[PDB]
Amino acid sequence: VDILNRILWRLLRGNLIFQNFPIEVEKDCFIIFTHGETLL
Amino acid sequence: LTPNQVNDELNKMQAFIRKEAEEKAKEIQLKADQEYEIEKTNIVRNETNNID
Amino acid sequence: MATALYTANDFILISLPQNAQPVTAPGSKTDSWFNETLIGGRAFVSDFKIPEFKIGSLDTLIVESEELSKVDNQIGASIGKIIEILQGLNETSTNAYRTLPINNMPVPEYLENFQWQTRKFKLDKSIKDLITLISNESSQLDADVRATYANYNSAKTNLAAAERKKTGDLSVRSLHDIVKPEDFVLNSEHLTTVLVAVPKSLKSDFEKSYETLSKNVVPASASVIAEDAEYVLFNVHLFKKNVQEFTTAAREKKFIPREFNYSEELIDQLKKEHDSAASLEQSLRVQLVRLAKTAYVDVFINWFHIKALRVYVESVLRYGLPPHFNIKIIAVPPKNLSKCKSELIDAFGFLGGNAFMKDKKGKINKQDTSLHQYASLVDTEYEPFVMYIINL
Numbered sequence A: 001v002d003i004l005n006r007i008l009w010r011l012l013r014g015n016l017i018f019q020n021f022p023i024e025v026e027k028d029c030f031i032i033f034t035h036g037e038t039l040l
Numbered sequence B: 001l002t003p004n005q006v007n008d009e010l011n012k013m014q015a016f017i018r019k020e021a022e023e024k025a026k027e028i029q030l031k032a033d034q035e036y037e038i039e040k041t042n043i044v045r046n047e048t049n050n051i052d
Numbered sequence C: 001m002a003t004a005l006y007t008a009n010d011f012i013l014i015s016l017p018q019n020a021q022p023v024t025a026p027g028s029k030t031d032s033w034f035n036e037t038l039i040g041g042r043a044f045v046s047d048f049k050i051p052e053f054k055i056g057s058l059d060t061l062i063v064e065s066e067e068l069s070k071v072d073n074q075i076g077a078s079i080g081k082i083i084e085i086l087q088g089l090n091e092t093s094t095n096a097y098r099t100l101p102i103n104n105m106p107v108p109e110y111l112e113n114f115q116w117q118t119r120k121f122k123l124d125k126s127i128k129d130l131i132t133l134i135s136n137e138s139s140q141l142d143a144d145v146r147a148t149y150a151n152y153n154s155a156k157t158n159l160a161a162a163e164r165k166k167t168g169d170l171s172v173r174s175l176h177d178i179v180k181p182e183d184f185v186l187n188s189e190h191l192t193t194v195l196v197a198v199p200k201s202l203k204s205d206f207e208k209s210y211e212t213l214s215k216n217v218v219p220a221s222a223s224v225i226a227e228d229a230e231y232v233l234f235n236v237h238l239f240k241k242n243v244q245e246f247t248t249a250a251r252e253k254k255f256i257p258r259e260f261n262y263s264e265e266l267i268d269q270l271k272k273e274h275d276s277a278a279s280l281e282q283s284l285r286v287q288l289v290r291l292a293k294t295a296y297v298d299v300f301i302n303w304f305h306i307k308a309l310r311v312y313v314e315s316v317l318r319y320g321l322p323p324h325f326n327i328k329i330i331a332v333p334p335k336n337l338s339k340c341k342s343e344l345i346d347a348f349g350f351l352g353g354n355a356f357m358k359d360k361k362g363k364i365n366k367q368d369t370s371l372h373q374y375a376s377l378v379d380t381e382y383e384p385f386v387m388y389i390i391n392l
Helices: A002-011 B003-051 C030-036 C058-089 C107-112 C127-166 C203-213 C243-253 C264-319 C337-352
Strands: A019-022 A028-031 C010-016 C044-047 C191-199 C224-227 C231-239 C256-258 C326-332 C387-390
Touching (some): B003 C058, C010 C337, C030 C044, C058 C127, C191 C203, C231 C243, C243 C256, C264 C387
Antiparallel strands (some): C010 C387, C191 C231, C191 C256, C224 C231
16 A cells, blocks of 8 residues: 555656555555546 | 645646646647538539539 | 755756745745745846647646656756766866856856747747657767767777887887888898897897897898887898797797888888877867867757756646746755755645655765655655756
């Protein structure tokens, strides 16, 4: 989750609202809000 | 964040969505006025050539 | 400061929204702030505003940013290589090309007259072809500098070799500086000449022994045709059959034969070789300095255009509105860089968003660690408002 947050923050320079909510191997959810287009 | 930060980002968003739409649509109908002239001239000129 | 030396004007490029306000000084306009407030009032603020071009789409906006980041690096790589060469030769100041005049106007002043310059670039060309165009020009100019510098090193090699023949030391030294018909034979059916390189001590021993050393040797042929500083060079006239026997007998004595045999075409071709090497290097050197300054001014203009374009484009992407963005370039006095970076971060960072805001303030120029150095590219940290730090 943290490395996906960092890679999407380095790809979209800012431009995102990244959340995570633990699903209750352990896993996790994520919401991105890719504000715009052409990187979707 | 702040509610305030989030509302500036909401205005900015609808601005970006709107920008994409005018700018693409503006191009599509300008090419279409040009298609009209060429195309219409072409159909007629063929048939008049036959009529002659 | 003392973790970095500066002695030449440094620049930070900012672009901000034209509706912005600093929270490090509320009740100020951004433009008024730069001049009065920023680093003790000693900031020089210069114009750097450029207008709108033609933007493909929103969609296209994304593709443009990515390229801009890449081309900016690449031009930066090139301009550094040109400067490194001019500096390396020390025939032009090493103490300039950080605040060396472009278009014979001081660099902070050059940026002040920089509003989007025209050389081949117009505001009615599309943005994708300006990104492409610029990079093609920069790559051509650098590849030219690299080739002429490449040629200049092959020329240095040739001039050293040729010189060694003209007077060096006898282990490759080929003779053409002595051209006498009394020290060499030519137009001869029975005779030839063998040159013997002899240690200076051993000179006496050579003088005694040579006639009897091989059979059938022209007597009173010993003459010192040349001398270096370690070896003495003798000419001996002898029978063609007997040359093999002399070279071999001589080596046992601790003489070193130098295989040379007199012919006019070899002598002429050794002198020409030396002549062409000298002429080639000298032409290349003048061409190399002239070319490097001319290429440097054009690449400077090219590079700043990508920085201007980029900062505007990145603003347009992140902020959207206003359609025209307030771009200023601030020329910072030496050693006040650390203070500058901090005051802008504090003041404007809030506009980018709290998530965007990280503290890793400070700067390490030594290779002890790679933290503390901002760039949006890395996930380690990010700039919190459109800010590029330009270090010439």
